[PDB]
Amino acid sequence: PGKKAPNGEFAGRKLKLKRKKFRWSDIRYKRRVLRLKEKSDPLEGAPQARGIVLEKIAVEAKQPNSGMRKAVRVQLIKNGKVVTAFCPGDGAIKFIDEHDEVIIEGIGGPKGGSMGDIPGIRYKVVKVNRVSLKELVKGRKEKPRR
Amino acid sequence: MKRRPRKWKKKGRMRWKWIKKRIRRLKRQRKKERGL
Amino acid sequence: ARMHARKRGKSGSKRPPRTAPPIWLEYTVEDIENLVVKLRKEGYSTAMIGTILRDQYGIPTVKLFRDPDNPNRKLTITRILEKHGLAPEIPEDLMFLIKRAVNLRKHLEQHPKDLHSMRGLQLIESKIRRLVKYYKRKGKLPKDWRYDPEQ
RNA sequence: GUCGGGCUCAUAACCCGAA
RNA sequence: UGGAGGUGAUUUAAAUG
RNA sequence: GGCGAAUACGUCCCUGCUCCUUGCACACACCGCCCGUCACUCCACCCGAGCGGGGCCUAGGUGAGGCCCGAUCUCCUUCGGGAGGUCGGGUCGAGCCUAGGCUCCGUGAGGGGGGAGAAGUCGUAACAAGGUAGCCGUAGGGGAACCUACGGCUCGAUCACCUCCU
């Protein structure tokens, strides 16, 4: 490869076109300008969402860890799509019941996705029947209507 | 097909020549059904 | 480097820097013009005339004398021939290339499978078209002049 | 084919005896 | 001292964790 | 303690160990590493008979309403004319109907590979000359990794000989 080109004083148009052409090779730029994330996001760009619990499940941790992680299947109010959400805390799965409404938010992993030894789960429960789950797991507050 | 010489390396994969043959066999079936 | 083969040959002439004709050269300008006209009438190219003048008459190039008419310029063989009306109608290098292309084309009519020689014809015709672009730019060829082998 | 013994770090292959 | 090429050859069977 | 021999004075063929050099995708260190089909569980996707529905351009029929020019009628006039009804003609026009072509969302019998899981299964293709050196292009064949033919590359081990260098 010779000297980087074009360098000429009157070659502005070609230099600008070169930079524009190879910028589409950057996956960050391409996803933002084409709005690809918006096209497939079940939360539709929101930082939090509300849904209704359909069942409780358990997911195995990935190798070489061992254990069962407790989660719920949630149907979102805004569009009816179903997603899996983690329930953080010791004994937290005992405060959840079927037909209850929950508030979920991102689980906080790399690239705005999953984390840790549980790939496949992208969300976590924050509130249950409009009460903070962290309080319930610690105490300091009671889950209403039995 | 386009050239990907990295695919020819053998560590942890089967031989690319035969992968290519399998892909071409699969593409023939799709083209036949597309004609009916 | 060479225009197509990319070789870097260096052979050529090494002219010393000088202004006046040497002391040992006795010919005047009129004798030199007469010699040039006589040689051209014998049927030689402009390059051949200078070769003969150097080799046989001991005349290093005619570009050592001032033009007797125009003091702004020195003498050349083509200028001398123009002064008498015997200058070529087509520039000589273009003419020699066209002549080479005509001979090669009739060879290819009898040898259609000689592909290596055909690339030579393609390179020659590229040279011819470069020269015609230059000469039309300078006005030495008419604007309607065109190169066509079928001519 | 069944059962037992060899060979091998061990299994398969292989060798031997028997009903 | 150290290197680059060419032509010939290669005496049964022998899987696995 | 008593009695008391045979054979060899060698070799690395078998079983193994030490050292130099060389190849290595191994370091849990060859009892290493590792590939594909079929079977099971889960996720996302592609092709798709049928199946409901929406939006655009056309071509034809219809058309609330607006404007202009006419004839006549009713009621008022300050005698200038001014409100409005009925009919004729011209012209403009949202909407509506039919047909034609593309476009989009929703379900969809059946078909196809992709990714995880952990092992149900058959073999051992690649890594050492990996036990037939490996690999590229093209073509045919095979449960599966793969095999074979022509041309090419070294990103191939070992011994002998030859050539070309420093």
Added chain:
RNA sequence: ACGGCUUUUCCGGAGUGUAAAAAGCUCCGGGAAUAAGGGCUGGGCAAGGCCGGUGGCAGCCGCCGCGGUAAUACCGGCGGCCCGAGUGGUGGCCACUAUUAUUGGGCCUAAAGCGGCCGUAGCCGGGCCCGUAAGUCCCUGGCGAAAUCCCACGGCUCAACCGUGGGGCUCGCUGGGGAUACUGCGGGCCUUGGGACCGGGAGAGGCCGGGGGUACCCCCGGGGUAGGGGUGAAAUCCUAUAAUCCCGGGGGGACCGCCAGUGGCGAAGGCGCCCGGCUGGAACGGGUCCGACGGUGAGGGCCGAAGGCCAGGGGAGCGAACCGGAUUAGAUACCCGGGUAGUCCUGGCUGUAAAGGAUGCGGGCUAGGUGUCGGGCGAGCUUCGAGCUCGCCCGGUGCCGUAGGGAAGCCGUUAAGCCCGCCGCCUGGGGAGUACGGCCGCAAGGCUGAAACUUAAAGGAAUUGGCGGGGGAGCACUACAAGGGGUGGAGCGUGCGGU
């Protein structure tokens, strides 16, 4: 714990404030009274090697990683750290990032130079003289609202905020004056780059016609008689219709040994028997000619190994598919005996390779040493040869190596070094060179080419070991070879498994 003090804030009042109220502000009485949380505590990263629970379960974890009964990492107690009326969680943009590179990145081995070349637009373009004044530089007129930004001073207790002045911002437009170095434009003059031409030479460069070389296969005739062929070992196969082997003749298709050389020629793919004809390119020698006619090259065009396809020929040898004999647990193979397409010629299509120097092309510059091919020059030999030896210049082709470069392997005037250009390509690993759409092809196929989703590495150069159905050297009766005596079969002593 004692002794004392204060009242921002708090409680109750008067005045001022206000359209009226409320806040605010000035005073008076009471009294330390009325006022601290959130996150974290294994590394990054400030802070515990303490105690009690749990025991690959529960749980933690942005990333790396913890937890398998003696947890500084999970839950809790006590301690400690950071920030503080705040402190944590989730999503987005900038920075981090020279992971978009004008300033300022990469492409031999890691992602990445089109298989090769010709050329259109564009970009980049050799020296001197004269003119112009478009680009460009300087001066000055008319403009680019206010708010927003920076500075000093002033008004609210200071500040935030607000006012008076100075500057900046909308980097853009326009009326005039001046300069001429560079770029652009017009005219003149050159020979250095490039091209043309002439001379004596070099070369498996290409096409066409003719003449040969051995070898091999088949057929006819003579001799001779029981085997030949082939493997690790065998068998199928050939042979008394006389083989293998030897001799005398006839026919056929492909291919050109030794000499042969990090030798030669060509853009690359590729090119090697001899003689004759046609034809392409290059080097050297050159006080010959033309006079910047140049570089690169989006689109576009031509060439392009093997294999494959379409028509017509040809078929010795070899040999996909296939048919038999073996090997093996199996053996759709490796080995052996046969064998269709194909390999060859003529006219077309296809456009693909580890098409690799895995290194795009042109120009200038930056120690040496030593081989070899072509041309030229000088000197000395000579059997007078188009012969031999030594030295120097130019152009090709190898090796060692200085400065410099690089992650290193290594490259190093045949650069992967310093500088002036133009074009092509790359932006973590997979999904995938796939799906969909288009163009091309008779067909096989070619060119162009995403997304959902998945994942913490993948990839490169070098180090120490271990291993190899790799090489070399050495050694041992728990190795062999040469030997002597046995154990394994019976009954019993004793130890082990199982029951």
Added chain:
RNA sequence: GGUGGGGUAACGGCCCACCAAGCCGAAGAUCGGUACGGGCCGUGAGAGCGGGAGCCCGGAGAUGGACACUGAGACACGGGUCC
């Protein structure tokens, strides 16, 4: 685009009659996607990259699609007509 008119507050293919074949485009037309424009705002050593609700200036709209009366000014958010 031209010639001759109409209409308008006014120039104009703004609309007609007649005569020509022009006009735009790989320096990206046409078509598709997204979006009110600017002063400014966030960030960065700077070169840059991203945004443009709130205040000021300009534009547009009054459930969707059409169309009129009065008036200096409207085809009128708290005025009129049809679907």
